[PDB]
Design a protein around this nucleic acid. Sequence first.
DNA 1: AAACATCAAGGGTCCC
DNA 2: GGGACCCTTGATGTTT
Length: 56
Amino acid sequence: KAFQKCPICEKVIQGAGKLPRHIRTHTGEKPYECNICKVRFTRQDKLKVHMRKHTG
DNA sequence: AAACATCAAGGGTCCC
DNA sequence: GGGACCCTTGATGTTT
Ligand SMILES: [Zn+2]
Ligand SMILES: [Zn+2]
């Protein structure tokens, strides 16, 4: 596949568009927000699993 | 105080 | 590249 290097930590990350996920570990930015409980996450899949709690 | 289940953070991998 | 799911590890709560 393809790999990327972190500009901050120099750790090798395997991901095409997965670098921003590792970037949001140092700065802790949360662009995704829940519609109901307003809980914020740094990853789209993490927001999806939170939505799974609302609808059983 | 081991054994055990649960949740989440972080990374790998596939598929569209 | 974004969406989606899985694998590994550590903190926390149960239970006996
Ligand atoms: Zn980094
Ligand atoms: Zn919610």
